[PDB]
Write an enzyme that holds these catalytic residues in place. Structure first.
Site, short mmCIF file in Angstrom:
data_model
loop_
_atom_site.label_atom_id
_atom_site.label_comp_id
_atom_site.label_asym_id
_atom_site.label_seq_id
_atom_site.Cartn_x
_atom_site.Cartn_y
_atom_site.Cartn_z
N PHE A 1 24.39 7.83 -0.94
CA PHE A 1 24.28 9.25 -0.60
C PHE A 1 24.49 9.51 0.90
O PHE A 1 23.75 8.97 1.75
CB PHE A 1 22.97 9.86 -1.12
CG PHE A 1 22.82 11.33 -0.83
CD1 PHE A 1 23.28 12.27 -1.72
CD2 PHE A 1 22.23 11.77 0.35
CE1 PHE A 1 23.16 13.63 -1.45
CE2 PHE A 1 22.11 13.13 0.62
CZ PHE A 1 22.57 14.06 -0.28
N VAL B 1 15.40 9.23 -3.90
CA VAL B 1 16.20 9.95 -2.93
C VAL B 1 17.52 9.22 -2.81
O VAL B 1 17.53 8.01 -2.63
CB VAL B 1 15.49 9.98 -1.60
CG1 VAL B 1 16.43 10.44 -0.47
CG2 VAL B 1 14.24 10.87 -1.70
N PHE C 1 -8.50 -7.76 16.95
CA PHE C 1 -7.69 -8.12 15.81
C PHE C 1 -7.49 -6.90 14.89
O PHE C 1 -8.46 -6.26 14.49
CB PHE C 1 -8.38 -9.25 15.07
CG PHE C 1 -7.67 -9.75 13.85
CD1 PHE C 1 -6.39 -10.29 13.95
CD2 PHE C 1 -8.32 -9.74 12.60
CE1 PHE C 1 -5.73 -10.80 12.81
CE2 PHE C 1 -7.69 -10.24 11.44
CZ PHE C 1 -6.38 -10.77 11.56
N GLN C 2 -6.24 -6.58 14.60
CA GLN C 2 -5.87 -5.48 13.71
C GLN C 2 -6.18 -4.08 14.23
O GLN C 2 -6.01 -3.11 13.48
CB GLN C 2 -6.46 -5.67 12.29
CG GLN C 2 -6.12 -7.01 11.68
CD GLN C 2 -6.77 -7.27 10.33
OE1 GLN C 2 -7.99 -7.13 10.16
NE2 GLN C 2 -5.95 -7.68 9.35
N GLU D 1 0.82 -1.23 0.00
CA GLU D 1 0.00 0.00 0.00
C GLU D 1 0.85 1.27 0.00
O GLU D 1 0.40 2.34 -0.46
CB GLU D 1 -0.99 0.02 1.15
CG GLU D 1 -2.02 -1.13 1.16
CD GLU D 1 -1.52 -2.43 1.86
OE1 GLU D 1 -0.28 -2.66 2.01
OE2 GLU D 1 -2.39 -3.25 2.26
C1 LIG Z 1 18.76 13.99 -1.27
C2 LIG Z 1 18.19 15.40 -1.48
C3 LIG Z 1 19.02 16.52 -1.42
C4 LIG Z 1 18.44 17.74 -1.61
N1 LIG Z 1 19.22 18.83 -1.56
C5 LIG Z 1 18.80 20.00 -2.12
C6 LIG Z 1 19.71 21.03 -2.47
O1 LIG Z 1 20.96 20.94 -2.27
N2 LIG Z 1 19.21 22.16 -2.98
C7 LIG Z 1 17.87 22.28 -3.23
O2 LIG Z 1 17.42 23.35 -3.73
N3 LIG Z 1 16.98 21.30 -2.90
C8 LIG Z 1 17.45 20.16 -2.32
N4 LIG Z 1 16.60 19.15 -1.99
C9 LIG Z 1 15.17 19.40 -2.21
C10 LIG Z 1 14.73 20.27 -0.98
O3 LIG Z 1 14.62 19.44 0.19
C11 LIG Z 1 13.38 20.93 -1.12
O4 LIG Z 1 12.50 19.89 -1.53
C12 LIG Z 1 13.37 22.00 -2.20
O5 LIG Z 1 14.62 22.72 -2.14
C13 LIG Z 1 12.18 22.92 -1.99
O6 LIG Z 1 11.76 23.37 -3.27
P1 LIG Z 1 10.57 24.45 -3.37
O7 LIG Z 1 11.02 25.58 -2.49
O8 LIG Z 1 10.01 24.67 -4.74
O9 LIG Z 1 9.60 23.54 -2.48
P2 LIG Z 1 8.00 23.39 -2.44
O10 LIG Z 1 7.91 22.53 -1.21
O11 LIG Z 1 7.46 22.85 -3.76
O12 LIG Z 1 7.52 24.88 -2.12
C14 LIG Z 1 6.44 25.48 -2.79
C15 LIG Z 1 6.37 26.79 -2.04
O13 LIG Z 1 5.63 27.69 -2.84
C16 LIG Z 1 4.43 28.16 -2.24
N5 LIG Z 1 3.44 28.25 -3.31
C17 LIG Z 1 2.82 27.23 -3.90
N6 LIG Z 1 1.98 27.69 -4.86
C18 LIG Z 1 2.12 29.04 -4.86
C19 LIG Z 1 1.59 30.08 -5.62
N7 LIG Z 1 0.69 29.85 -6.59
N8 LIG Z 1 1.96 31.36 -5.38
C20 LIG Z 1 2.83 31.64 -4.42
N9 LIG Z 1 3.35 30.65 -3.69
C21 LIG Z 1 3.03 29.36 -3.89
C22 LIG Z 1 4.14 27.11 -1.18
O14 LIG Z 1 3.39 27.74 -0.12
C23 LIG Z 1 5.56 26.69 -0.75
O15 LIG Z 1 6.13 27.65 0.16
C24 LIG Z 1 17.07 17.89 -1.83
C25 LIG Z 1 16.23 16.79 -1.88
C26 LIG Z 1 16.82 15.55 -1.69
C27 LIG Z 1 16.00 14.28 -1.71
C1 LIG Z 2 13.24 5.11 3.90
C2 LIG Z 2 14.55 5.79 4.04
N1 LIG Z 2 15.52 5.15 4.71
C3 LIG Z 2 16.74 5.70 4.85
C4 LIG Z 2 17.00 6.96 4.33
C5 LIG Z 2 18.42 7.50 4.55
N2 LIG Z 2 19.08 7.48 3.24
C6 LIG Z 2 19.01 8.58 2.43
S1 LIG Z 2 19.81 8.35 0.87
C7 LIG Z 2 20.20 6.73 1.32
C8 LIG Z 2 20.97 5.91 0.34
C9 LIG Z 2 20.08 5.51 -0.82
O1 LIG Z 2 20.54 4.29 -1.47
P1 LIG Z 2 20.24 4.12 -3.06
O2 LIG Z 2 18.79 4.07 -3.40
O3 LIG Z 2 20.94 2.86 -3.47
O4 LIG Z 2 20.73 5.52 -3.68
P2 LIG Z 2 22.31 5.89 -3.90
O5 LIG Z 2 22.62 7.11 -3.08
O6 LIG Z 2 23.05 4.62 -3.52
O7 LIG Z 2 22.42 6.17 -5.37
C10 LIG Z 2 19.74 6.40 2.68
C11 LIG Z 2 20.03 5.06 3.25
C12 LIG Z 2 15.94 7.62 3.65
N3 LIG Z 2 16.03 8.85 3.08
N4 LIG Z 2 14.75 7.02 3.51
#
Ligand SMILES: Cc1cc2nc3c(=O)[nH]c(=O)nc-3n(C[C@H](O)[C@H](O)[C@H](O)COP(=O)(O)OP(=O)(O)OC[C@H]3O[C@@H](n4cnc5c(N)ncnc54)[C@H](O)[C@@H]3O)c2cc1C
Ligand SMILES: Cc1ncc(C[n+]2csc(CCOP(=O)(O)OP(=O)(O)O)c2C)c(N)n1
Ligand SMILES: Cc1cc2nc3c(=O)[nH]c(=O)nc-3n(C[C@H](O)[C@H](O)[C@H](O)COP(=O)(O)OP(=O)(O)OC[C@H]3O[C@@H](n4cnc5c(N)ncnc54)[C@H](O)[C@@H]3O)c2cc1C
Ligand SMILES: Cc1cc2nc3c(=O)[nH]c(=O)nc-3n(C[C@H](O)[C@H](O)[C@H](O)COP(=O)(O)OP(=O)(O)OC[C@H]3O[C@@H](n4cnc5c(N)ncnc54)[C@H](O)[C@@H]3O)c2cc1C
Ligand SMILES: Cc1ncc(C[n+]2csc(CCOP(=O)(O)OP(=O)(O)O)c2C)c(N)n1
Ligand SMILES: Cc1ncc(C[n+]2csc(CCOP(=O)(O)OP(=O)(O)O)c2C)c(N)n1
Ligand SMILES: [Mg+2]
Ligand SMILES: [Mg+2]
Ligand SMILES: [Mg+2]
Lengths: 522, 524, 527
Positions: free
Chosen positions: A464, A379, A111-112, A49
């Site tokens: 990562f 991620v 249950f559950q 799910e």
């Molecule tokens: C492994 C990993 C590493 C990451 N590292 C980085 C990084 O180094 N740099 C990076 O930039 N990101 C990084 N991120 C992503 C980061 O965590 C955030 O998801 C991202 O930076 C936020 O983007 P955003 O501000 O568009 O977010 P959103 O969450 O999409 O924000 C939307 C914003 O806009 C507002 N909004 C929505 N609609 C409207 C509208 N019509 N008018 C006005 N406002 C509106 C909302 O209220 C909200 O504040 C990473 C993600 C991962 C998985």
């Molecule tokens: C459910 C969950 N568990 C653990 C983490 C911590 N974590 C973030 S990136 C990562 C490594 C991801 O492994 P993979 O999918 O093989 O991506 P890679 O960085 O190896 O390319 C872990 C363990 C997370 N973000 N989410």
């Protein structure tokens, strides 16, 4: 005369829902029975799910419309939770129907037994138990309205016995679609902003997904005041194309041009962003923030001037008030920084006989994928490579778990994307950790016949941010499941492997052994 | 410039324009008290029960339209706020609650006074978080204040006493930029659809709630243009029921026949900025249209055939020029005739008598002798009925109660907040004997704070709205005198006029204890 | 049996022996009120604020040792119970709260008075559930009542007013079987280990809390056998501090030197049925042994070198014959000498004066003139300090407060519950002026219920324990205006006669005593 469950299904039908994602259970009999006799909403059966929730989130992201998932009582609906956090954090309209134990057994340790109406509070803006059939018209109306207009998850918890009871006879099932309102700051506030910009220098714009739909205004605004744009990751698909002002990203996965432009700005305008990494905002600059959500304002930085407004209509009202600036030194320097940064990025993405640089792999994915492909990325390192190497163009899409940050999102989201857009190419950039974490739903790709192109960045590690994965051959696993598998170990094999995968009339898994890399770019 | 987390909070509130904080102290609030004393600008308002601090802050926020603040010490202290915070949140008024918490080192151990306020207050707030680390306070406080003000409700910041005393982050800023509400109006296409719908609808009524505040002019013009009688929800009364030839009263059990019938008989119903909760009072075969800024209100208590998200003022301004004037005024005229009959029935109940004082007479006379711009509060119970039916509003007078959360005992505590917020203004608390005695200790706050509240107790020696309904017969005037406030005991209808006039003239607080009869709700 | 859900609840409570339900009515309680009227056995106790109903029920349960019950109407009604329920639950007394709820059809719609009591009360209960369906009530009520009684704490049953009026399940049974606590004793091997440890330990002190209730005889015999001075936690005072030549007082800020030093200087410390929460008062260098029935108490406020789960009475009975008598009594004798010095310091503070009335004099005189089996309650604030230091216990007197939850304003509401539970017994509420006024409305309950509570207000016109200034109030005048006798005391010489008068009067009395600001410190005795 119809059951509570039938009333729900009919109302969803009227609101235009096309499918419900889940796994059945006896607690869902009322719902299943309604769906079968209705024959319009399609039931999408996943293996876990969690994947149903991710997939519904991807559907809602792409369609812009209400998506629905469901889970049986206890463990069934509980399985949705991580995917619902992703939906809610991505601000996409999703209704979760959480079937519940028979109401007569509640409070006895049955249950559950769980209490879904408590569990899901954090990952929803509406969450309630339907104890009485008389509740369903109000509960469903509020749930659906909040999901759509507040852009997030609503949860309706429905004991299986209550689902089978008669709905209220006068209840209506027709749904009126109310669009977002126009939201724009007071004229005086716009005048104040225009005046502030008039007397500000070295302005940068930090743009997030709130800029979706405002490309034209955004680019015109940047050009008018000569402000380089940096985008947050979720702004990338909306901002990083046909945009001579865009200079990349900051944060650890961003790059030098984004980093410096942000740090060195004297005036920073946050447009529709939630960029969360506080240390990357400059220390002493005026900061201006425009957002529709008061909760975003000041969440990750000080704010010297705040305005509540939707970006498109705010910029439309603001533009005529803003005087054109001649001074473009800051912008030109940012653009020069950007040229250097892109070149550094490109040097890392070359073929080699040593090992396949994942950044080469990502670059080639971007080169050979369709003009309007939908990309999802796990991620982990695949998020880095997507951020840095996928070229966007206003038609392509990029989905991930960027806010909630969950591993294993890519393939499940791809599943939802592909079902929503059956004619469109969908490319899942998966980690080996991510893919194997929810591997069972690989079988859903076959069962649902969704031609998802899965590319596994097989670094046989949880790479990562060490912690090793046993050398796995995912191509072999694919073949055993009845999907084409291509094992890629030499950089020279990459181009043809991707082209083959994309041409094949069906789903394909490309298992690419990639080198461990670093985050920084020298 | 080193400063504590608590000082940072106080300075930021100061910058946002907060004038006072309501509460009761405790050691867990030392950081905050220390910095309020050093600062000398925000005033500490000490109540006898923290519940009253919360009600009072809510009344202040209601009247000023600006952020109000209350505080409680750890465990029981802040826990005492909870019923008042429900009232604040349900009334949609901007309130920040600072819940001081036990020392963070003792959390999870079953410590003296341990509670988890960050969980308790979830339901009665839209933001509620524990500050474990000084580094959180700038983000947590910014979001808390912004949500309280712009989302119009309660935010809670939970602050362990030890964390309060730690240094705030050095780069944090304390200046607050005041962002007003945006303009929110439905897309043009939706307005044209609504205009078209109205053009082909008949027998239209408007159900108007407090969302119409500030839109009187547009509302009245709209009703007149399409010939729609207006009924108002209770919280719309002060905003809608004056200079309004279209207003025909209220429905619900405390409403009256004209409101009742106009609502039931309408073929088209337009809900404007309302949350009127009593589902059985909405008509059964009508087109229902609802306009609200909050998606959560849409369809909450009725089916909806057409929904629009918009602020009432700006929506009606954009809608009016699109709406064609209707000539057909039969429905309106019949509603107005119903109204004339209903208001006469109401008036017949409000007569002096030698038998016993009809509370509706008492309420009528309060309305007659109170100032043109009096602020009224009324206890949940019969006083809410009498206020609804007998207080005449005029665009200057105000009416506060606990109309959504429905708590007894709100009137005097809200009066306390009103009076402090508007020291020059007349404030009249219409209290029940149950309500007054339920939080009676803060009667002493009226003296201690020197707030000239006029308290009128509807002394029916019962819990009259609704075994355990009998209250031992009590002389509240005597109690007032013993507390050093003037008390007037009224037992004959002929004494009412002079008692109210004297109470209102006295340069100080007064309690008028009026023995009133038990009354029926329905009206013949 | 054709009957409603509410009637089923009332009958079941009746069968469990409940005598009264504390609350304030509302329409959401119609089913219940109806049932109580028709039944005519359980008495409805109407307070002015539901918070007081909860405190009072807690006091009733504390004194009777039996299930007590309170109720509140929907939304604000039951919400008002919450602070008093925290007190009940923290005091480990069996209390059932019936939280009436809005009509179930309106739930989730933002209805008039809507709250979610089944979520709010989670922390201050060990059972808390919504009854959506009549079919739930037999299981929900059975578990609620069983947990309240046997786990000793609060259970909450949330009951929408419409569901209350529906038919109860026809086969449900209303008879209640009373199951007593089991005997709980550590495994023989563990007792042997403990005995061996004690045999090789020196300078042993016992820290005793209310878990020692009912074990006085065994406790005193144990202390004497191994020569261990006893210090008691506040909630152990009434159970431990009498007929006990080993007791040397209390530690913590309101304790005193002998307790403080005995605790700090022990080389071996045995925690017996205690939750004493102030971590810095435990010795840093000693072997610590803890015996408790509740695993959650073990190690909650100190390290533990040896833990045993057991009830104190059973455990000591099984342990005593295994424990060798120790001859070495130096540590005990020094503690007793410290104690003599400390009590003398305490006594020097409790003198009459012409300057102002020392509250410690007032407390001492209350103890001197109150009945030999009086029930005392004391407000959180200075009255708790004075009660702790000056009330003499004797195995018949009782002391109630809000010692764990630490809420102001508990004393009079608890007095209300105590007096109703023991109508023939003298009840003395030691109130603060802040405490009394914080829930002052229920002073009217004292008249309405005709409960002859003796209220003594420590009127220091301040929030004295910890913006603390309160306008000079005359509470005696307020009492008179409410129809209760009020005595205003301003001179120390008037105290004796005022207390004697108050205690003799055949009715409730408020004695309003203007007292001085004091300190917690006690100056040392000559060395
Ligand atoms: C492994 C990993 C590493 C990451 N590292 C980085 C990084 O180094 N740099 C990076 O930039 N990101 C990084 N991120 C992503 C980061 O965590 C955030 O998801 C991202 O930076 C936020 O983007 P955003 O501000 O568009 O977010 P959103 O969450 O999409 O924000 C939307 C914003 O806009 C507002 N909004 C929505 N609609 C409207 C509208 N019509 N008018 C006005 N406002 C509106 C909302 O209220 C909200 O504040 C990473 C993600 C991962 C998985
Ligand atoms: C459910 C969950 N568990 C653990 C983490 C911590 N974590 C973030 S990136 C990562 C490594 C991801 O492994 P993979 O999918 O093989 O991506 P890679 O960085 O190896 O390319 C872990 C363990 C997370 N973000 N989410
Ligand atoms: C004892 C008692 C009996 C009662 N009985 C009755 C009764 O018989 N009849 C009765 O009517 N009431 C009665 N009530 C009061 C009743 O419960 C509700 O409090 C009241 O009816 C709701 O009024 P409202 O719609 O103004 O409420 P509010 O909660 O004030 O509704 C405001 C609505 O407007 C929206 N809004 C706010 N600002 C804007 C804006 N700028 N533009 C557009 N929309 C906006 C909000 O989202 C919300 O939906 C009683 C109360 C008590 C204590
Ligand atoms: C203003 C104020 C100041 C205070 N300062 C002090 C102070 O200085 N010093 C002080 O001592 N107190 C003080 N307190 C009270 C203090 O906070 C604690 O409540 C008290 O010390 C706990 O006493 P106790 O261990 O008996 O607690 P209880 O909470 O009564 O703990 C009973 C323990 O015994 C266990 N138990 C119960 N029954 C059995 C059984 N049959 N067998 C075995 N175990 C059992 C329970 O599980 C629990 O662990 C103060 C209170 C206030 C209001
Ligand atoms: C805190 C609280 N307790 C109980 C109720 C249920 N209730 C509603 S009105 C009422 C009686 C009101 O008494 P009083 O203040 O004297 O008003 P009146 O008798 O004039 O109706 C009660 C018990 C409530 N709404 N709030
Ligand atoms: C409900 C509540 N609010 C606040 C506190 C914090 N507090 C502890 S003692 C105290 C002073 C109590 O005043 P009073 O009742 O007059 O006692 P005394 O003055 O004798 O110390 C305060 C305000 C608390 N423990 N409980
Ligand atoms: Mg990997
Ligand atoms: Mg009354
Ligand atoms: Mg005091």
């Amino acid at each position: 005369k119809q059951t509570v469950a039938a009333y729900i299904a009919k109302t969803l039908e009227s609101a235009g829902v096309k499918r419900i994602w889940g796994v059945t259970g006896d607690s869902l009999n009322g719902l299943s029975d309604s769906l079968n006799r209705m024959g319009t909403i399609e039931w999408m059966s996943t293996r876990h799910e969690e994947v149903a929730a991710f997939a519904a989130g991807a559907e809602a992201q792409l369609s812009g419309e209400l998506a629905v998932c469901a889970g049986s009582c206890g463990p069934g609906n509980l399985h949705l939770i991580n995917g619902l956090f992703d939906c809610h954090r991505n601000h996409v309209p999703v209704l979760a129907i959480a079937a519940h134990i028979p109401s007569s057994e509640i409070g006895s340790g049955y249950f559950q037994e769980t209490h879904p109406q408590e569990l899901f509070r954090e990952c929803s803006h509406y969450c309630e138990l339907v104890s009485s059939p008389e509740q369903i018209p109000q509960v469903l109306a509020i749930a659906m309205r909040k999901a759509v207009l507040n852009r997030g998850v609503s949860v309706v918890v429905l004991p299986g016995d209550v689902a089978l009871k008669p709905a209220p006879e006068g209840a209506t099932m027709h749904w009126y679609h109310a669009p977002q309102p126009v939201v724009t700051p007071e004229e005086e506030e716009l005048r104040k902003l225009a005046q502030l910009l008039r007397y500000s220098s070295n302005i940068a714009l930090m743009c997030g997904s709130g800029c979706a739909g405002a490309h034209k205004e955004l680019v015109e605004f940047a050009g008018k005041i000569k402000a380089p744009i940096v985008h947050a990751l979720r702004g990338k698909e909306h901002v990083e194309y046909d945009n001579p002002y865009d200079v990349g990203m900051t944060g650890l996965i961003g790059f030098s041009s984004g980093f410096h432009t942000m740090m060195n700005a004297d005036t920073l305008v946050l447009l529709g962003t939630q960029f969360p990494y506080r240390a990357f905002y400059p220390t002493d600059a005026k900061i201006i923030q425009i957002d529709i959500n008061p909760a975003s304002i000041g969440a990750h930085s000080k704010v010297d001037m705040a305005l509540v407004g939707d970006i498109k209509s705010t910029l439309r009202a603001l533009l005529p008030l803003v005087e054109e600036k001649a001074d473009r030194k800051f912008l030109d320097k940012a653009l020069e920084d950007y040229r250097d940064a892109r070149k550094g990025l490109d040097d890392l993405a070359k073929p080699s006989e040593k090992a396949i640089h994942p950044q080469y792999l990502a670059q080639q994915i971007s080169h050979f994928a369709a003009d309007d492909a939908i990309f999802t990325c796990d991620v982990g390192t695949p998020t880095v490579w997507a951020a840095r190497y996928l070229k966007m163009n206003g038609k392509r899409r990029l989905l991930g778990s960027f806010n909630h940050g969950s591993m294993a999102n890519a393939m499940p989201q791809a599943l939802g994307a592909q079902a929503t857009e059956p004619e469109r190419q969908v490319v899942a950039m998966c980690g080996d950790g991510g893919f194997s974490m929810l591997m069972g739903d690989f079988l859903s790709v076959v069962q649902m016949k969704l031609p998802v192109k899965i590319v596994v960045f097989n670094n046989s590690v949880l790479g990562f941010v060490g912690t090793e994965l046993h050398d796995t051959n995912f191509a072999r696993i694919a073949e055993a499941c009845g999907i084409t598998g291509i094992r890629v170990e030499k950089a020279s094999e990459v181009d043809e492997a991707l082209q083959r995968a994309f041409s094949i009339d069906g789903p394909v898994l490309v298992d690419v052994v990639v080198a461990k890399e670093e985050l920084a770019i020298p």
